[PDB]
Design a binder for this molecule. Sequence first.
Ligand SMILES: [Ca+2]
Ligand code: NA
Length: 102
Amino acid sequence: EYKPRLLHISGDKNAKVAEVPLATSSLNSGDCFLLDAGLTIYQFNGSKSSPQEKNKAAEVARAIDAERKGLPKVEVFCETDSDIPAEFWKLLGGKGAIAAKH
Ligand SMILES: [Ca+2]
Ligand code: NA
């Protein structure tokens, strides 16, 4: 399905993924998120996220890609990156300040 959804990867060393409301306000600097927009999957790594969380997010993205027979494009970026795509923020309802924690 190409209806955008936001997945939240948390747990620090014990990474878990779960859908959360699709909004910028659902994000936080300590975790990882996958904004699944259908043809494009955006992976946002919180600046304080853990290696296990990054790996989990990547694993979920590959699984989604596999189910979709490789059609989606996957973009990965760190929270502090200077070239995060504008579409990521647009789909989240607009760029804004991220909570330090969930
Ligand atoms: Ca692909
Ligand atoms: Na975390």
